[PDB]
Design a binder for this molecule. Sequence first.
Ligand code: CO
Ligand code: ZN
Ligand code: ZN
Lengths: 136, 138
Amino acid sequence: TLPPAWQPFLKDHRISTFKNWPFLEGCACTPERMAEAGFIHCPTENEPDLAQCFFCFKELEGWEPDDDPIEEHKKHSSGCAFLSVKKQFEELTLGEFLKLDRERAKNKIAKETNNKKKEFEETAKKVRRAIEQLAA
Amino acid sequence: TLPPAWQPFLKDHRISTFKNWPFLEGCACTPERMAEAGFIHCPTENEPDLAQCFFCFKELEGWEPDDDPIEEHKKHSSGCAFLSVKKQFEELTLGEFLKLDRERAKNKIAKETNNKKKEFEETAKKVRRAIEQLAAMD
Ligand SMILES: [Co+2]
Ligand SMILES: [Zn+2]
Ligand SMILES: [Zn+2]
């Protein structure tokens, strides 16, 4: 086994996160392909087909049977290292892996920082809204 | 920042396990040479210089300043896979690692199994004697 934090590096673990995925058997964006492209399944009320790259954390919804997880991945996050890892998990050296887990950790941080930023911006709109109604 | 169970694979972790190791600067079995050979410092009371291979689990106490940890280790446990690993830690592929780790768990179990055996054997000898002391005198 691997510590939980590094399990999503395993393709077969990423697959297993796909429970109740609509596009199965004869589609292009099959669970295996979603997985091979680094995607993990994480549904919500609004978006039920929401998927996220375990590495860069980009989120994509609105999938269609003809979609190719890999091109979609490129198209929305071309600066994602996982998109370069040519070797398979076992073929990597602890040094390469550790370098990767660290890029990922920065990635995480970047996403968390980008969210906190969106929220701040949202709060700003509200405060601006309030001051305006009040300044009237 | 690997998980605890895997930290002993790091020479530095093992080196740091040496607290109050008698042999320093001028000796052969220094902490580094000890760590370099897989040893970790787990001292008891009866034995303050107890050292154990993090991989096969063989223990060794009573070290003199001129002992070569690797030599000793090659003698008291020649089967230890770790004595074969030539690559540095970061130079190992995950497959090579995962396999080294699997075999280490086998080595642990094997140790636990023999303790359990010896303790069970000791218990049996006492039960056997106690029953004899009775079914003899009456
Ligand atoms: Co589309
Ligand atoms: Zn990505
Ligand atoms: Zn050993």
